């Protein structure tokens, strides 16, 4: 692509590990942080995709 | 007839419906909202009807 490939993704954050041949696909927060955020996706709180 | 199976049954992980007709079973990996239609009946005494 001449400017981007915003089509292909990948999770940076995780609770923890998976087993091995496991599909986990899912639109979510990720609770980064002390602060108990409830879908705010900005700080201290990141897209894992 | 059914057992059912998955994780809180909601549309953001997906889950499973097994359920076994009078000659038949379908299995849906699938991530229904929601299943929650008993279609209740009037009658449920089953000394009648
Ligand atoms: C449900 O059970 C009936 C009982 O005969 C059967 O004819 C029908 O095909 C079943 N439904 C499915 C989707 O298999
Ligand atoms: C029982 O059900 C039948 C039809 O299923 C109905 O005609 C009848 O009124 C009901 N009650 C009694 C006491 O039979």
């Known amino acids: ?12 954050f995780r609770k923890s ?9 899912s639109t979510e927060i990720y609770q980064a942080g002390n602060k108990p955020c ?3 996706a900005g700080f201290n709180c990141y897209f894992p995709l | 007839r059914g057992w059912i199976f998955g ?3 909601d549309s953001k992980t997906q889950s499973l419906l097994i359920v076994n007709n009078a000659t038949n079973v379908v299995i849906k990996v699938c991530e229904f909202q929601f299943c929650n239609d008993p279609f209740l009946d009037v009658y449920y005494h089953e000394n009648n009807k």
Do not use: A, H
């Not at chain 1, 692509?1 to 915003?6: D, E, I, M």
């Open chain 1, 1 to 12: 692509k001449v400017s981007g490939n915003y089509n292909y993704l990948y999770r940076l």
């Open chain 1, 17 to 25: 590990k998976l087993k091995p041949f496991e599909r986990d696909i």
């Open chain 1, 38 to 40: 409830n879908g705010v």
């Open chain 2, 7 to 9: 994780t809180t049954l």
